[PDB]
Design a protein around this nucleic acid. Structure first.
Length: 86
RNA sequence: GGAGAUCUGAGCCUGGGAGCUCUCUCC
């Protein structure tokens, strides 16, 4: 995997509802750059992962570095570059 | 077809979870 516009965040707190996770993510990650969209996809079992698509790859890079392992709803975020740019 | 829905619909697969397929709702 290599840098791209989208970051993949797993290990989120599934106890939080979708909309509240999307807005918290937007408020914290918008600090690094303009965000085009945030996806919290529906999966077979409790959704605990999201995609944040920044407008500039530089924003995804600093975000990936700064917020790596940072507590988010009492759970440390595990951040990656998306396998496929979204 | 499109858009949504399960810690609050479901069966498989996985067995150190970015998997597949259904069902339902709306257009």
């Amino acid at each position: 995997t290599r840098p791209n516009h989208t970051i993949y965040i797993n290990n989120l707190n599934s106890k939080i509802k979708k909309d509240e996770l999307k807005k918290s993510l937007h408020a914290i990650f918008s600090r690094f750059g303009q965000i085009l969209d945030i996806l919290v996809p529906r999966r077979r079992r409790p959704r605990g992962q999201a995609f944040v698509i920044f407008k500039e790859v530089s924003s995804a890079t600093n975000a990936l570095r700064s917020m790596q392992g940072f507590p988010f709803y009492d759970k440390p975020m595990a951040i990656q570059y998306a396998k496929t740019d979204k």
